[PDB]
From Swiss-Prot, chain A:
Acts as one of several non-catalytic accessory components of the cytoplasmic dynein 1 complex that are thought to be involved in linking dynein to cargos and to adapter proteins that regulate dynein function. Cytoplasmic dynein 1 acts as a motor for the intracellular retrograde motility of vesicles and organelles along microtubules. High expression in heart, liver, brain and pancreas; moderate in placenta, skeletal muscle and kidney; low in lung, prostate, testis, small intestine and colon. Isoform 1 expression is up-regulated in 64% hepatocellular carcinoma (HCC) patients. Belongs to the GAMAD family. It comes from Homo sapiens. One of its GO terms (molecular function) is dynein intermediate chain binding. This is Dynein light chain roadblock-type 1. The keyword Lyase does not apply.
From Swiss-Prot, chain B:
Coiled coil: none annotated. Keywords: Acetylation, Cytoplasm, Cytoskeleton, Dynein, Microtubule, Motor protein, Transport. High expression in heart, liver, brain and pancreas; moderate in placenta, skeletal muscle and kidney; low in lung, prostate, testis, small intestine and colon. Isoform 1 expression is up-regulated in 64% hepatocellular carcinoma (HCC) patients. The keyword Acetylation applies. It comes from Homo sapiens (Human). This is Dynein light chain roadblock-type 1.
Length: 86, 87
C-alpha cells in the first residue's frame, strides 16, 4: 500500500505468506530478499515463544528497533514494515 | 535497587527481570515461578532477535524489542532487561 509506504520514516513494506514467500512488496527485489527469509524464521520464533510462555495467548504485533532502523511486523500472512528509528 | 521499584510501579507494568548473557535471571521483581516462566523462553527469543538483525545487516545492532500479544506486552533492552506489562 502507497499510503503506508508514504508515511514519514517508512522505507518499505513486504507481505509474506505463511511459508515466508513475499507475495507483495513495495521494495526492490534484492532488498525484499535481504529481509523476507530472515524475517520469516524470526517471526515464527516470536509467535512460538508467546505460545510457549502462555498457550492461550497470541502474538499480535512486533517492533524490532536497532541502531540503523526499526522493523514492525503484524500477523494477519505477515505484514513487514521497515522504517527509520522512531 | 531504587530504579527497579520506580519502573515496576509504572502504570501497566507487571514485572521486571534482568537476565545475563546465558539467560540466567540475576535480578527480578517477580515471584520465582513467574520469573522461570519467562527467563528461559525469552532468552532464546532474544538471541534470535539479535542474530536476525545482524544477518540482515552485519553492521547493525538490536537496541530494543517490543512483543505485543492479546494478553500482554513484553519489552526487552540489551545483560538483557525484560519488562512484562499490560497491552
Ligand atoms: Cs516514505
Amino acid at each position: 500500500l502507497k499510503r503506508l509506504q508514504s508515511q514519514k520514516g517508512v522505507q518499505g513494506i513486504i507481505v509474506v505468506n505463511t511459508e515466508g514467500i513475499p507475495i507483495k512488496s513495495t521494495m526492490d527485489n534484492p532488498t525484499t530478499t535481504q529481509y523476507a527469509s530472515l524475517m520469516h524464521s524470526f517471526i515464527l520464533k516470536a509467535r512460538s515463544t508467546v505460545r510457549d510462555i502462555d498457550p492461550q495467548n497470541d502474538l499480535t504485533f512486533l517492533r524490532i528497533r536497532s541502531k540503523k532502523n526499526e522493523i514492525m511486523v503484524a500477523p494477519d500472512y505477515f505484514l513487514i514494515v521497515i522504517q527509520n528509528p522512531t
